[PDB]
Design an enzyme around this catalytic site. Structure first.
Site, PDB file in Angstrom:
ATOM      1  N   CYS A 161      14.574  12.004  40.353  1.00 28.32           N
ATOM      2  CA  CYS A 161      14.715  13.448  40.519  1.00 28.32           C
ATOM      3  C   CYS A 161      13.450  14.123  41.012  1.00 28.32           C
ATOM      4  CB  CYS A 161      15.131  14.086  39.194  1.00 28.32           C
ATOM      5  SG  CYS A 161      15.462  15.839  39.236  1.00 28.32           S
TER       6      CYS A 161
ATOM      7  N   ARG B 187      12.039  17.770  38.814  1.00 28.91           N
ATOM      8  CA  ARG B 187      11.602  17.770  37.430  1.00 28.91           C
ATOM      9  C   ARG B 187      10.546  18.798  36.968  1.00 28.91           C
ATOM     10  NH1 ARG B 187      10.238  11.720  36.609  1.00 28.91           N
ATOM     11  NH2 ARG B 187      10.261  11.654  38.916  1.00 28.91           N
TER      12      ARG B 187
ATOM     13  N   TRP C 172      20.339  22.934  40.901  1.00 30.81           N
ATOM     14  CA  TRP C 172      20.677  23.616  42.147  1.00 30.81           C
ATOM     15  C   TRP C 172      20.256  22.670  43.263  1.00 30.81           C
ATOM     16  CZ3 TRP C 172      17.207  26.192  38.739  1.00 30.81           C
ATOM     17  CH2 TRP C 172      15.843  25.969  39.018  1.00 30.81           C
TER      18      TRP C 172
ATOM     19  N   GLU D 188      20.335  17.606  50.809  1.00 31.80           N
ATOM     20  CA  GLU D 188      21.423  16.892  50.151  1.00 31.80           C
ATOM     21  C   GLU D 188      22.734  17.194  50.856  1.00 31.80           C
ATOM     22  OE1 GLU D 188      21.380  16.727  45.673  1.00 31.80           O
ATOM     23  OE2 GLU D 188      19.985  18.388  45.954  1.00 31.80           O
TER      24      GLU D 188
HETATM   25  C1  HEM Z   1      17.035  22.456  39.143  1.00 32.51           C
HETATM   26  C2  HEM Z   1      17.258  21.806  40.307  1.00 32.51           C
HETATM   27  C3  HEM Z   1      17.225  20.432  40.537  1.00 32.51           C
HETATM   28  C4  HEM Z   1      16.859  19.935  41.730  1.00 32.51           C
HETATM   29  C5  HEM Z   1      16.346  20.699  42.962  1.00 32.51           C
HETATM   30  C6  HEM Z   1      17.045  18.502  41.672  1.00 32.51           C
HETATM   31  C7  HEM Z   1      16.928  17.647  42.787  1.00 32.51           C
HETATM   32  C8  HEM Z   1      17.368  16.312  42.813  1.00 32.51           C
HETATM   33  C9  HEM Z   1      17.647  15.559  44.027  1.00 32.51           C
HETATM   34  C10 HEM Z   1      17.480  16.046  45.487  1.00 32.51           C
HETATM   35  C11 HEM Z   1      18.163  14.371  43.638  1.00 32.51           C
HETATM   36  C12 HEM Z   1      18.742  13.271  44.511  1.00 32.51           C
HETATM   37  C13 HEM Z   1      20.216  13.563  44.741  1.00 32.51           C
HETATM   38  C14 HEM Z   1      20.930  12.466  45.536  1.00 32.51           C
HETATM   39  O1  HEM Z   1      20.328  11.929  46.489  1.00 32.51           O
HETATM   40  O2  HEM Z   1      22.094  12.166  45.216  1.00 32.51           O
HETATM   41  C15 HEM Z   1      18.175  14.362  42.208  1.00 32.51           C
HETATM   42  C16 HEM Z   1      18.539  13.236  41.476  1.00 32.51           C
HETATM   43  C17 HEM Z   1      18.636  13.198  40.083  1.00 32.51           C
HETATM   44  N1  HEM Z   1      18.392  14.301  39.254  1.00 32.51           N
HETATM   45 FE1  HEM Z   1      17.690  16.166  39.758  1.00 32.51          FE
HETATM   46  N2  HEM Z   1      17.487  18.109  40.422  1.00 32.51           N
HETATM   47  C18 HEM Z   1      17.627  19.284  39.707  1.00 32.51           C
HETATM   48  C19 HEM Z   1      18.169  19.324  38.411  1.00 32.51           C
HETATM   49  C20 HEM Z   1      18.552  18.183  37.642  1.00 32.51           C
HETATM   50  C21 HEM Z   1      18.914  18.274  36.254  1.00 32.51           C
HETATM   51  C22 HEM Z   1      19.171  19.581  35.438  1.00 32.51           C
HETATM   52  C23 HEM Z   1      18.992  16.955  35.824  1.00 32.51           C
HETATM   53  C24 HEM Z   1      19.344  16.437  34.563  1.00 32.51           C
HETATM   54  C25 HEM Z   1      19.321  17.149  33.416  1.00 32.51           C
HETATM   55  C26 HEM Z   1      18.682  16.105  36.924  1.00 32.51           C
HETATM   56  C27 HEM Z   1      18.778  14.678  36.876  1.00 32.51           C
HETATM   57  C28 HEM Z   1      18.669  13.831  37.978  1.00 32.51           C
HETATM   58  C29 HEM Z   1      19.003  12.419  37.996  1.00 32.51           C
HETATM   59  C30 HEM Z   1      19.156  11.565  36.727  1.00 32.51           C
HETATM   60  C31 HEM Z   1      18.982  12.024  39.305  1.00 32.51           C
HETATM   61  C32 HEM Z   1      19.303  10.659  39.924  1.00 32.51           C
HETATM   62  C33 HEM Z   1      20.837  10.639  39.991  1.00 32.51           C
HETATM   63  C34 HEM Z   1      21.392   9.400  40.676  1.00 32.51           C
HETATM   64  O3  HEM Z   1      20.826   8.297  40.454  1.00 32.51           O
HETATM   65  O4  HEM Z   1      22.392   9.551  41.427  1.00 32.51           O
HETATM   66  N3  HEM Z   1      18.412  16.840  38.056  1.00 32.51           N
HETATM   67  N4  HEM Z   1      17.745  15.596  41.691  1.00 32.51           N
HETATM   68  N1  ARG Z   2      20.107  18.823  43.066  1.00 32.75           N
HETATM   69  C1  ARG Z   2      20.930  18.100  42.337  1.00 32.75           C
HETATM   70  N2  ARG Z   2      21.030  18.361  41.040  1.00 32.75           N
HETATM   71  N3  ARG Z   2      21.652  17.118  42.908  1.00 32.75           N
HETATM   72  C2  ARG Z   2      22.608  16.247  42.197  1.00 32.75           C
HETATM   73  C3  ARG Z   2      23.393  15.312  43.135  1.00 32.75           C
HETATM   74  C4  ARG Z   2      24.102  16.105  44.238  1.00 32.75           C
HETATM   75  C5  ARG Z   2      24.445  15.273  45.493  1.00 32.75           C
HETATM   76  N4  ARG Z   2      23.202  14.757  46.141  1.00 32.75           N
HETATM   77  C6  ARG Z   2      25.235  16.136  46.492  1.00 32.75           C
HETATM   78  O1  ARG Z   2      24.785  16.291  47.644  1.00 32.75           O
HETATM   79  O2  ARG Z   2      26.309  16.660  46.109  1.00 32.75           O
END
Ligand code: HEM
Ligand code: ARG
Ligand code: HEM
Ligand code: HBI
Ligand code: HBI
Ligand code: ARG
Ligand code: ZN
Lengths: 409, 411
Positions: free
Chosen positions: A108, A111, A280, A285
């Site tokens: 992520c 974070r 968000w 993405e």
């Molecule tokens: C507030 C805005 C947030 C942004 C901008 C963000 C952004 C991202 C992005 C760009 C990815 C990769 C998505 C993909 O390629 O499918 C990601 C992956 C991930 N995020 Fe965040 N995230 C946010 C909030 C969260 C929250 C609230 C959680 C958990 C409580 C979280 C947990 C994770 C996890 C565990 C992954 C890897 C998921 C996977 O392996 O498919 N994210 N996030």
């Molecule tokens: N910013 C996030 N929380 N992304 C969670 C996974 C969303 C996914 N990559 C999509 O395009 O639908």
């Protein structure tokens, strides 16, 4: 023992000591790196240590490591495990665990916002209808009229593995995918299989391009049930371009709330199999992956055409040119409609800041470079030049088999 | 132990058995991945095994494994080793060795061309002037008036570690970099330290933005000497844009021949510390990295201004738009001047085909995803969607310390 990571653009060098507390494996070995591989019930004996490890970090976090409270709690949980063969977390421990699972999510890039997570304790839930209610409340709270707020809803933990709560959808909100006679695919190819398990379940699909799927909720190990998320609760954005008026004609739209719902949250050995969370979007993405992947909406050529670009030879970089314009459209549309969204430059910059904060206040930050670097303009973002160490810390979010491959109706 | 990799865009799954032949380490452990870390004399004891391993692979490839010729060669080498603490490769073995170091280079996306490597044996070289001559011939051969041909020149192997042959330059052709008193840099910032060494050694720096550096060559452990590559042998390309006539006014240009000259080639345990090699450029190397890295020429802003893009907020993706145009400019200029070059789309599609072929005919293809995926438009190139396994096979190309850090100056 102590590892260092250098940023080749700023020369900043960080020392990582946090990885020393790593528990789980990485898929890699002294002989082979599997860093680019997408996917590399407990007994009383197994649970005790996990619970102890967790409580130690928890009490340590509240500056009460080794206090009577710490010892007492540890003793209490210990007794509970021996008796019930499991245990229940205090509300405080639950919130701490969830926030830390996000804090520990090496893939992520968002974070820096980890401590602001809103946690909805749905451990008292017992039925599919109850799950639907909790989920609608989560969606409404997190959407917040476009001023998105991160949140997670935690349903009952696993027991014997035959009473697991599961959300069959991969995201609370996603578009349907149906195989056409044309051989083509209408809607989202990524969701064809799930879409057919629903339609099969009775879902009357408008068989359209951007049709919001129904929730397929599974409570207490029972068979899943369908529900239509109140349309008034699904915020969507029509995609148009700040310069190409023909863009809107493309007929494109996406939802504003990214809510991963098929993962498993582990805290102190306990497994929460239904824990949908949301934040968000980062522009790419949608604009790069969802819209341009060949196995997704795959819309590059069509956009390239409308732009009247020389698509005869790859070397004219028509795909690249189009890619940028599309992504400019996504960000423009969201921003226009006042819906929270972040561009990859801004997001990566914040992640670099978060990494530094993490290194000094925590001794490190597990990060998966393969996933952190955006799918477009890689080296133009700061994370590209940042060395990262990937390792697994708990509490954590883990992948888990799709239920339809485990469920026995 | 069979390891499988899947391509998430085509669902094609491949099985890797080749990693079993990997003996070197990766830097990673079962508890930590160092996949994004840039940089994670031998004795008879250790040389024997390494030589046998190599000769066995060599004789198998020529379908003579176990032959008398194979056995005699092993006997010949071991005797030579005990007798001299080292050994000399046959010409055929050297060619085989060099080609395979390329084939085994996990960070190289251009490996579909590995078998066509032209190998120049410069093991009879004894002086820096001799090295210069070999290098001039390599550049002229490889450049081929713009129709680039891959080549490598191999100078004498290391013996006692005190008589090393080294090319102090990081690439045979590269532009000087000069740190100005006001803190800015004229030219290429990546070569500032080497430029200073050249000046100190006697080079009269023209102090321009694109000054081709002189060669600094070390033969047989002696102090390095300076040589100027004949200007007529250095092919350059002025960079212009097919639609923006002001692009040419940026005054940009680049050399056509990419020739890494600071790596170490290991074959059968032997170490070749001076083994300059060249191919041809993938556009993004110049367009994205050399021109847009903040620590290189860093031209994004200027290009962005001339295009009058909204640079007030990043969400305009002005950085991205300019980056694309710059890369369009590089490819177009090279193609117009008829100088070999490959765009990232074409190169990555070719690598995927090469990789699949390798799995089928060889049982695998070590590949470093972090390096293989292009620095721009990652996911719209097939390699982004391809799972890869990274491991080290020999023969191989390895990094080595910059010579100025280890050289014992004779004066
Ligand atoms: C507030 C805005 C947030 C942004 C901008 C963000 C952004 C991202 C992005 C760009 C990815 C990769 C998505 C993909 O390629 O499918 C990601 C992956 C991930 N995020 Fe965040 N995230 C946010 C909030 C969260 C929250 C609230 C959680 C958990 C409580 C979280 C947990 C994770 C996890 C565990 C992954 C890897 C998921 C996977 O392996 O498919 N994210 N996030
Ligand atoms: N910013 C996030 N929380 N992304 C969670 C996974 C969303 C996914 N990559 C999509 O395009 O639908
Ligand atoms: C034929 C054309 C070639 C193409 C298009 C090609 C392309 C590339 C590219 C794009 C890179 C990444 C460079 C960087 O980011 O700095 C690379 C790395 C590499 N290539 Fe190739 N290559 C070619 C020929 C060769 C040859 C002839 C050899 C060896 C005989 C070779 C050896 C390597 C090695 C060892 C690396 C890693 C270098 C490092 O760590 O800095 N390549 N190649
Ligand atoms: C094979 C490779 O691991 C896969 O294509 C990748 N997927 C993703 C990635 N990064 C993100 N953020 N999301 C992905 O789905 N990096 C590479
Ligand atoms: C830290 C990180 O490994 C570093 O910035 C990278 N450099 C490179 C890379 N890929 C290529 N081709 N060349 C690099 O120099 N991937 C990432
Ligand atoms: N295609 C090659 N053989 N490249 C060698 C490395 C060249 C280096 N990336 C440069 O931009 O100068
Ligand atoms: Zn690894």
């Amino acid at each position: 023992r102590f590892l260092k990571v250098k940023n080749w653009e700023t020369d900043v060098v960080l020392t990582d000591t946090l990885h020393l507390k790593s528990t789980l494996e990485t898929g890699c070995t002294e002989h082979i790196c599997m860093g680019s591989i997408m996917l590399p019930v407990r007994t009383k004996d197994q649970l005790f240590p996990l619970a102890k490890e967790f409580l130690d970090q928890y009490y340590s976090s509240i500056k009460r490591f080794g206090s009577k409270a710490h010892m007492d709690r540890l003793e209490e949980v210990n007794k509970e495990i021996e008796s019930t063969s499991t245990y229940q977390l205090k509300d405080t421990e639950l919130i701490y665990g969830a926030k830390h699972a996000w804090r520990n999510a090496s893939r992520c890039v968002g974070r820096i916002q980890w401590s602001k997570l809103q946690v909805f304790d749905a451990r008292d839930c017992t039925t599919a209808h109850g799950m639907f209610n909790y989920i609608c409340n989560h969606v409404k709270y997190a959407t917040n009229k476009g001023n998105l707020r991160s949140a997670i809803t935690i349903f009952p933990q696993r027991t014997d593995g035959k009473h697991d709560f599961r959300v069959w959808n991969s995201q609370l909100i996603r578009y349907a995918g149906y195989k056409q006679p044309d051989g083509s695919t209408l809607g989202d190819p990524a969701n064809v299989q799930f879409t057919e398990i629903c339609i099969q379940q009775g879902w009357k699909a408008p068989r359209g391009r951007f049709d919001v799927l129904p929730l397929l909720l599974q409570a207490n190990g029972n068979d899943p049930e369908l529900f239509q998320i109140p349309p008034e609760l699904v915020l969507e954005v029509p995609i148009r371009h700040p310069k190409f008026d023909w863009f809107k004609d493309l007929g494109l739209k996406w939802y504003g709330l990214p809510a991963v719902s098929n993962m498993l949250l582990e805290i102190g050995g306990l497994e929460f199999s239904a824990c949908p969370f949301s934040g968000w979007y980062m522009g790419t993405e949608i604009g790069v992956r969802d819209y341009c992947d060949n196995s997704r909406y795959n819309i590059l050529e069509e956009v390239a055409k409308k732009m009247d670009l020389d698509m005869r030879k790859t070397s004219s970089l028509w795909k690249d040119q189009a890619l940028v314009e599309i992504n400019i459209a996504v960000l423009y549309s969201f921003q226009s409609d006042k819906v929270t969204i972040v561009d990859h430059h801004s997001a990566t910059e914040s992640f670099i800041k978060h990494m530094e904060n993490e290194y000094r206040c925590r001794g490190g930050c597990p990060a998966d470079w393969v996933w952190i670097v955006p799918p477009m303009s890689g080296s133009i973002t700061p994370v590209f030049h940042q060395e990262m160490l990937n390792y697994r810390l708990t509490p954590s979010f883990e992948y888990q088999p799709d239920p339809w491959n485990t469920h026995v109706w």
